[PDB]
Amino acid sequence: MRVYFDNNATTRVDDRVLEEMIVFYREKYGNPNSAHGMGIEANLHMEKAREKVAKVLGVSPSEIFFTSCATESINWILKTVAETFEKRKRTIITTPIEHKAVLETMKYLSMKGFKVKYVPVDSRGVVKLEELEKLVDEDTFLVSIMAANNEVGTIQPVEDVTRIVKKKNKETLVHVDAVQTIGKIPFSLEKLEVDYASFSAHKFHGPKGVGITYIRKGVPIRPLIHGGGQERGLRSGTQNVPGIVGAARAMEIAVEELSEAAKHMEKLRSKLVSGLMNLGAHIITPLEISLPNTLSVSFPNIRGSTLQNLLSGYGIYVSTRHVLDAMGVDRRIAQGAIRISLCKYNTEEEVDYFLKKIEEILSFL
Amino acid sequence: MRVYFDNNATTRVDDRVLEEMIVFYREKYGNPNSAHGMGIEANLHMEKAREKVAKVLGVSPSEIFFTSCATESINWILKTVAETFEKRKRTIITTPIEHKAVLETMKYLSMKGFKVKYVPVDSRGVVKLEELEKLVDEDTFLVSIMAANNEVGTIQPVEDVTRIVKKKNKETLVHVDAVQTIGKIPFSLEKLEVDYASFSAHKFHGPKGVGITYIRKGVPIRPLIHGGGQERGLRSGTQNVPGIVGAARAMEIAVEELSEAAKHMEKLRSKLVSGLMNLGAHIITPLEISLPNTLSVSFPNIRGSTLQNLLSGYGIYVSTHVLDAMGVDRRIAQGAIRISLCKYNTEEEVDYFLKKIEEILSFL
Ligand SMILES: *Cc1c(COP(=O)(O)O)cnc(C)c1O
Numbered sequence: 001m002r003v004y005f006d007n008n009a010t011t012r013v014d015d016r017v018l019e020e021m022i023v024f025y026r027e028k029y030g031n032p033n034s035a036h037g038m039g040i041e042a043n044l045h046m047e048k049a050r051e052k053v054a055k056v057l058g059v060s061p062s063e064i065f066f067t068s069c070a071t072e073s074i075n076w077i078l079k080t081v082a083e084t085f086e087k088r089k090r091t092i093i094t095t096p097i098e099h100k101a102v103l104e105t106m107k108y109l110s111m112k113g114f115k116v117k118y119v120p121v122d123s124r125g126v127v128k129l130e131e132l133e134k135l136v137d138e139d140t141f142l143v144s145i146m147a148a149n150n151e152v153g154t155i156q157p158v159e160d161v162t163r164i165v166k167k168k169n170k171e172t173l174v175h176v177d178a179v180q181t182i183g184k185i186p187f188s189l190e191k192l193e194v195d196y197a198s199f200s201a202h203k204f205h206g207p208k209g210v211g212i213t214y215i216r217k218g219v220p221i222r223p224l225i226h227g228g229g230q231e232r233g234l235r236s237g238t239q240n241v242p243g244i245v246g247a248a249r250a251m252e253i254a255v256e257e258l259s260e261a262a263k264h265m266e267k268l269r270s271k272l273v274s275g276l277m278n279l280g281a282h283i284i285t286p287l288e289i290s291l292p293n294t295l296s297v298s299f300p301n302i303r304g305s306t307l308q309n310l311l312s313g314y315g316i317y318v319s320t321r322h323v324l325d326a327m328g329v330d331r332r333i334a335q336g337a338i339r340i341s342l343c344k345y346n347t348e349e350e351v352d353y354f355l356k357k358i359e360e361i362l363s364f365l
Numbered sequence: 366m367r368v369y370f371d372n373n374a375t376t377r378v379d380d381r382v383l384e385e386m387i388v389f390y391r392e393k394y395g396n397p398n399s400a401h402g403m404g405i406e407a408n409l410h411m412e413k414a415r416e417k418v419a420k421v422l423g424v425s426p427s428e429i430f431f432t433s434c435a436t437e438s439i440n441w442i443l444k445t446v447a448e449t450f451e452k453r454k455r456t457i458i459t460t461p462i463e464h465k466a467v468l469e470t471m472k473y474l475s476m477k478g479f480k481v482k483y484v485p486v487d488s489r490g491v492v493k494l495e496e497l498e499k500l501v502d503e504d505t506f507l508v509s510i511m512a513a514n515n516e517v518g519t520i521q522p523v524e525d526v527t528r529i530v531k532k533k534n535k536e537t538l539v540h541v542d543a544v545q546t547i548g549k550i551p552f553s554l555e556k557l558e559v560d561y562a563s564f565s566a567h568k569f570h571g572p573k574g575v576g577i578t579y580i581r582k583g584v585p586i587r588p589l590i591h592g593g594g595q596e597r598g599l600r601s602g603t604q605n606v607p608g609i610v611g612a613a614r615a616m617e618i619a620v621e622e623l624s625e626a627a628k629h630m631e632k633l634r635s636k637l638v639s640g641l642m643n644l645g646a647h648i649i650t651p652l653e654i655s656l657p658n659t660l661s662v663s664f665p666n667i668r669g670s671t672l673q674n675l676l677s678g679y680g681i682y683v684s685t686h687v688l689d690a691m692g693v694d695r696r697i698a699q700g701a702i703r704i705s706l707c708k709y710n711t712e713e714e715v716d717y718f719l720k721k722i723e724e725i726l727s728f729l
């Protein structure tokens with residue numbers, strides 16, 4: 001049996017999404033910027049996708065931008081916003097549990113002369129709100145937080161972070177890496193009061209090669225990619241129409257089936273939690289404040305990679321750092337840590353299979 | 366019938382290409398950076414794609430990088446190469462007929478304090494070699510030239526350009542926007558001696574959302590996209606595996622059938638040229654030094670947009686600074702439409718095009 005439990009790394013495209021995408025590869029393949037009939041037709045569907053994404057997120061179509069991935073969206077926002085504040089402001093705040101897309105960009109901005117401060121997180125991986133309040137100063141133009149951690153699944157208090165940041169400095173902008181939200185926990189930007197947000201379609205059964213960016217009307221931004229003038233002149237290059245259409249459909253389906261999908265994942269996760277603890281596993285993920293499909297565990301007596309390799313040999317796929325370290329997790333636990341991440345298509349039969357095979361693997365070791 | 370003559374704007378994905386892509390959406394959907402079996406499988410196919418592209422272009426697999434589009438590649442190269450020369454060198458040279466991906470990036474680098482020089486082109490759209498030799502100096506760290514113009518089709522003397530540039534300053538790097546080459550004219554980087562080149566899969570029956578970048582082993586480059594470490598740490602973000610696999614297969618097919626395709630397109634283009642000239646059309650495209658599929662024509666006293674609009678109504682798709690750089694008269698420019706064929710266009714479509722465009726000219 002093939003058991004894919006690494007959905008936080010990427011997901012299989014939904015059959016409904018793929019079907020819609022094929023139309024744009026085979027029939028409506030026009031360039032959305034062309035003034036002719038096939039061009040206007042492509043542009044129509046691209047705009048319909050943008051509107052569908054805006055509706056799901058609760059924002060205006062004009063605030064939705066398409067990129068090649070969330071990593072691009074993140075580089076774009078962090079780097080161009082910084083660029084608009086050069087000579088004026090110099091302080092940026094984020095957390096040490098952010099994805100490398102954010103961290104490596106912050107590392108780059110540091111080299112360029114910016115001051116990046118890191119708000120620590122507690123042992124459950126939740127940002128320390130009291131330390132955040134202190135770190136935010138008048139020279140702070142941007143705060144970048146994630147809606148949920150990809151490795152351990154810890155959900156962050158975005159609303160409190162936004163409220164606390166605005167009270168300490170009304171002008172500070174907030175960016176939310178919202179990649180792990182869609183289809184796992186509810187996420188609307190309608191009343192969230194953030195300025196920028198990043199999403200990746202392949203994390204919610206959408207295709208790879210497509211990122212989604214929310215940029216609040218009027219906030220700072222410049223092009224990371226200059227050229228033909230696509231995306232209101234802010235991100236040039238021919239738009240990945242098939243991808244954009246699939247991604248929008250994927251987002252809509254993910255949010256529409258959220259309630260049922262979340263209950264189901266939460267249920268499969270509880271079966272995994274108990275079955276693994278009974279085999280000697282330490283649970284790293286804080287179950288009460290985490291994505292319902294995510295479960296980071298550890299068998300301290302075994303290297304995570306060794307466990308990962310053996311599971312893969314049995315047709316079971318899981319994944320295997322800077323996050324656990326920031327959480328104060330013991331090095332021995334971190335060394336044997338593996339991440340199990342479900343999707344709406346995972347079943348109880350796969351969980352039973354996973355528990356049975358992992359027990360065998362463990363007895364041989 | 367439906368006649369798509371706007372292949373230089375984008376093309377329909379080859380059925381053979383799409384068939385391969387579908388496998389990566391449905392079955393082999395692992396993250397190529399994942400350490401497990403599905404990750405290894407995706408990484409494997411992604412590396413095969415890289416090798417297939419390297420083989421086609423005559424370079425090493427380690428010199429091939431995948432992006433989201435040629436525009437991203439162009440931004441990546443121009444912006445980060447310039448970044449490495451900050452406070453050292455400050456002059457960049459390009460032409461006025463370059464695609465906006467290049468011109469807009471130059472406009473940005475100019476605003477950032479770099480000195481951008483523009484080598485003029487002749488009335489046929491060919492870069493003036495004498496002026497190039499003159500403009501390149503010791504402060505010139507990079508020269509960006511296109512292999513062929515997308516609007517009028519003019520093929521540029523890339524070898525001469527590189528040769529002239531190296532003799533004047535052996536340290537100057539050369540980037541070639543090679544987007545309009547693949548599947549239209551032969552293009553190998555094996556003995557070309559350039560440092561960077563950009564390609565766009567959707568211009569050769571590959572998917573949209575995929576760019577191919579050639580970076581000579583050892584030349585300057587920094588990440589435009591920082592993050593997880595993908596593409597040798599030079600371009601992060603989860604790689605578009607289905608697209609990469611599709612783009613490589615498309616490139617392989619395009620080049621493998623270039624000989625037959627280019628002759629077929631040239632035959633179709635000549636029939637179009639004669640038919641259009643026998644209707645009063647001025648031919649803006651230099652037939653002697655241009656892509657075999659491209660034809661920029663203009664009817665006196667008829668706006669290109671109007672002509673394009675009517676052609677579209679008849680199920681015929683064509684498109685409407687390059688002309689300004691070539692010295693083309695305003696009136697002729699305003700009437701310009703661009704016809705661009707692909708290997709799948711037919712003689713039947715050309716006849717239909719000629720018959721309907723005449724009918725249209727009578728109503729206008
Ligand atoms: C996957 C992920 C990213 C990066 O997505 P790419 O699609 O690879 O660009 C960024 N942030 C988080 C939280 C992620 O899970």
Ligand SMILES: *Cc1c(COP(=O)(O)O)cnc(C)c1O
Pocket residue numbers: 236237238373374434435436437464466511513514515542544545565567568
């Ligand atoms: C189409 C084109 C580009 C841009 O390609 P995108 O895929 O839209 O990034 C760049 N240069 C030339 C010559 C082109 O024809």
